[PDB]
């Protein structure tokens, strides 16, 4: 199947949170390049084309790899509204 599908189920109380988590996470993960990635150089996803291993364009597949290391944190409340719509832009170039 998909990587550690069972383990990634356990991380959340409900099926759907992990879907909301993953997608939302991926959104940021492929908004700010892949500059936000709490996942090290050597543990990044890769392809095989042209005879050359190049990082996987599949945002959705990254966030899953990411959360699987527990490096993220999730909840119903963590930050305010447009008050996050500036923080991630400055720490990771929002251009």
């Amino acid at each position: 199947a998909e990587p550690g599908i069972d383990k990634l189920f356990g991380m959340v109380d409900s099926k759907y949170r992990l879907t909301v988590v993953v997608a939302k996470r991926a959104q940021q993960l492929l908004r700010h390049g892949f500059k936000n990635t709490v996942l090290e150089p050597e543990e990044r996803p890769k392809m095989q084309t042209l005879e050359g291993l190049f990082d996987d364009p599949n945002a959705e597949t990254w966030a899953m790899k990411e959360l699987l290391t527990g490096r993220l944190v999730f909840g119903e409340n963590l930050v305010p509204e447009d008050r996050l719509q500036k923080e991630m832009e400055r720490i990771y170039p929002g251009e």
């Binding site: 759907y16 490096r71 993220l72 944190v73 119903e76």
Partner: protein, 37 residues
């Protein structure tokens, strides 16, 4: 045509947020800007 009232469209989950260990320092970005003099 509205979002469905279920699944990933259930008021229960929906609002779930995600952030990273480093942007977890956004709490200390607003942490040290208050008392003056």
């Amino acid at each position: 045509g509205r979002l469905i009232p279920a699944g990933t469209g259930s008021d229960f989950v929906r609002f779930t947020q995600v952030v990273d260990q480093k942007t977890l320092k956004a709490i200390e970005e607003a942490r040290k800007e208050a008392v003056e003099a």
